[PDB]
Structure formats: structure tokens, C-alpha cells
């Protein structure tokens, strides 16, 4: 099917490089480290998303005046005025930021929140990109063993 579609468009011939893995068993020793666990990975993606959703709803309920990713000033955007938008912002920026979510948001200098947002950001860091990527990395390291 892919080889035939390669004539209608000359880019489906890139899918034929998967034959070096699914046809020749020269990469099984390596790929058997990711495909051995299986279910565990889907449970991990099904748990990380729940924890990120909890952090998102907490931010929506207590951190309105922070999600202000304005450019050039007085252009409010990428705010928390929508649950789905805030959830997407979290899942797209806070996970891949490498330093939690506190490095992509405003400085938590506001009163009555100076400590609550510190707990929020540092707990997000310690619970999302520290002990939920460690689970994936241990699911990949244990499979080799």
C-alpha cells in the first residue's frame, strides 16, 4: 500500500525505512526495551495526564493573574481563561520546559500567593518531570536488564 501510494506522492517511500526494524530482527535487542513493558507505559501516560490536569485546575482556580504571556505589552494571550487552553498550555510547555512550569510564568511576587505558588511550581517540578519521567526511564532501563 505504501509503495503504491509512493507513486501518487514521492514521500510515502519514507515509511519503508520502518522495514529495517519490523522486517529484519537486527534492532530487536534495542527495541525490545521499549516494547517489552507496554501497558505500563500507557498507565504512565494515563497518570501523568491526570496529575497535570490537577495542576491545571489548581492554577485555574488560584493563579489567574499569572498566565499573561503577552508580547510587546498590553496583548493578553495564552491565559487561563479557558480550561482546555490552560490544559494544553500545561501539557505543551510545563512538561517540556525542563525546569518545571515556574520558568514560563510570571514571577510569583504577588501577595497571598507568594508561598502557595512556590509550592505549586516546586511540586509540579518534583512530581511531573522528576518522578513521572523517572518512571518512564526506569521502564526503559529495567527492560535491558
Amino acid at each position: 500500500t505504501m509503495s503504491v501510494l509512493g507513486h501518487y506522492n514521492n514521500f510515502f517511500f519514507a515509511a519503508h525505512l520502518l522495514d529495517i526494524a519490523m522486517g529484519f530482527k537486527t534492532l530487536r535487542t534495542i527495541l525490545s526495551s521499549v516494547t517489552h513493558n507496554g501497558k505500563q507505559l500507557v498507565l504512565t501516560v494515563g497518570l501523568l495526564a491526570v496529575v497535570v490536569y490537577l495542576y491545571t485546575v489548581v492554577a485555574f482556580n488560584f493563579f489567574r493573574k499569572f498566565y499573561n504571556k503577552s508580547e510587546d505589552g498590553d496583548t493578553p494571550d495564552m491565559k487561563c481563561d479557558d480550561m482546555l487552553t490552560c490544559y494544553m498550555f500545561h501539557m505543551y510547555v510545563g512538561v517540556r520546559a525542563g525546569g518545571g512550569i515556574g520558568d514560563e510564568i510570571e514571577d510569583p511576587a504577588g501577595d497571598e500567593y507568594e508561598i502557595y505558588r512556590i509550592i505549586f511550581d516546586i511540586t509540579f517540578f518534583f512530581f511531573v518531570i522528576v518522578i513521572l519521567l523517572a518512571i518512564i526511564q526506569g521502564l526503559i532501563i529495567d527492560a535491558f536488564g
Binding site: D111, E112, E114, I115, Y116
Partner: peptide
């Protein structure tokens, strides 16, 4: 007003240990 009073309120409970 929570950036400074938290540590003071946390240590104000250990006065019962300082007295003993």
C-alpha cells in the same frame, strides 16, 4: 502577607520545647 510570617509561625510552636 505570607512571605515572612510562615517561618515565624512554624517556630512559634517549638517554644514549648524551648521552655522544657
Amino acid at each position: 502577607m505570607t512571605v515572612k510570617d510562615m517561618v515565624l509561625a512554624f517556630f512559634s510552636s517549638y517554644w514549648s520545647v524551648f521552655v522544657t
